[PDB]
Design a binder for this molecule. Structure first.
Ligand SMILES: N#Cc1ccc(N2CCN(Cc3ccc(COc4cccc5c4CN([C@H]4CCC(=O)NC4=O)C5=O)cc3)CC2)c(F)c1
Ligand SMILES: [Zn+2]
Length: 312
């Protein structure tokens, strides 16, 4: 590729002038902490994963302002339909105004996992969560990490973590799997146990389908390509604050193209998106990205929403 695999990770569609916070905050294990809960996101965050956010409502804008004064850390719960979650630490901040509307744009990172002990909704409607920090641990597993990396090569072609705990959350966050399996991987405390399950999951992986119809195969594990350092799967925020997880793939099937290619708010700079819908149900599965210059090495790719896809 000729693209910069570090620009998808900068989220420059959010504005190119953000504050940076370098400090870190790691709570101790078994510790019990009260943290604000992100109000609209319904995702399963993995430690290491990056969360882009676009906040408009006064209640949400004031919260994030109190987080910057305090820990800059909040809670993202894993919903079975919320007994576990992950913490997210803001590392970049930017305040905007549009027609007298205060917009906040934040970039956050998954940090530590937790088990919800108690929940509270407050006067502003923003929920708060009393969580016990779950532990990670020690140990090594090089045989496993190498067998998992052998399989990932038979799928696509040191962009991969070298630490068992870090590698385990990279597969957790980048494998094409159901949210029921992401939770299972998040309920484990040892990395060795997680890398094992993750190797089974991918040996039993299948094509991905349209979730609305369960009748069209859109793509497979062997078409996944990484155009970003983060990985083949990355979260992005649309113009209305809706965060999507996107699988980047070279070929997608059973999709129709609606509209003319556009560059506005593109998550992949230099490219242009066109809505792709299922050929049978017409449900929005994602977008087809196309290059604005003939010199760009990946001239076309697909970005598919993990929300519109179900494993076969
Ligand atoms: N309170 C308050 C408040 C809140 C929000 C305000 N405004 C929001 C809109 N902004 C102007 C605008 C208009 C129209 C468009 C067309 O594009 C759209 C439209 C709808 C959904 C999606 C996309 C693109 N897209 C993906 C495709 C893949 C990719 O690469 N990137 C993406 O984003 C989507 O999912 C873009 C920007 C101006 C600000 C505000 F003015 C006040
Ligand atoms: Zn369909």
């Amino acid at each position: 590729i000729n693209f910069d695999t570090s620009l998808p990770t900068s989220h420059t569609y959010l504005g190119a002038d953000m504050e940076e916070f370098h400090g870190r905050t790691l709570h101790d294990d078994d510790s019990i902490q009260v943290i604000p809960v992100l109000p609209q996101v319904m995702m399963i965050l993995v430690p290491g994963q990056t969360l882009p956010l676009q906040l408009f409502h006064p209640q949400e804008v004031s919260m994030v302002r109190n987080l910057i004064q305090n820990d800059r850390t909040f809670a993202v719960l894993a919903y079975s339909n919320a007994e576990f979650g992950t913490t997210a630490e803001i590392y970049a901040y930017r305040e905007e105004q549009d027609f007298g509307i205060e917009i906040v744009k934040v970039k956050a990172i998954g940090r530590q996992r937790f088990k919800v002990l108690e929940l509270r909704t407050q006067s502003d409607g923003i929920q708060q969560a009393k969580v016990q920090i779950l532990p990670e641990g020690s140990g090594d597993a090089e045989t496993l990490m190498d067998r998992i990396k052998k399989q990932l090569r038979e799928w696509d072609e040191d962009s991969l973590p070298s630490n068992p705990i870090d590698f385990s959350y990279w597969v957790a966050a980048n494998l094409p799997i159901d949210d029921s399996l992401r939770i299972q991987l998040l309920k484990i405390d040892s990395a060795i146990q997680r890398l094992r399950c993750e190797l089974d999951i991918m040996n039993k992986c299948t094509s991905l389908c349209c979730k609305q119809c369960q009748e069209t195969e859109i793509t497979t594990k062997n078409e996944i390509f990484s155009l970003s350092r983060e990985g083949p799967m990355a979260a992005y925020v649309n113009p209305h604050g809706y965060v999507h997880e996107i699988l980047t793939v070279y070929k997608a099937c059973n999709l129709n193209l609606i509209g003319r290619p556009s560059t506005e708010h593109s998550w992949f700079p230099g490219y242009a998106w066109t809505v792709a819908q299922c050929k049978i149900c017409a449900s929005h599965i994602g977008w087809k990205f196309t290059a604005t210059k003939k010199d760009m090495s990946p001239q076309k790719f697909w970005g598919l929403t993990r929300s519109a896809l179900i494993p076969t």
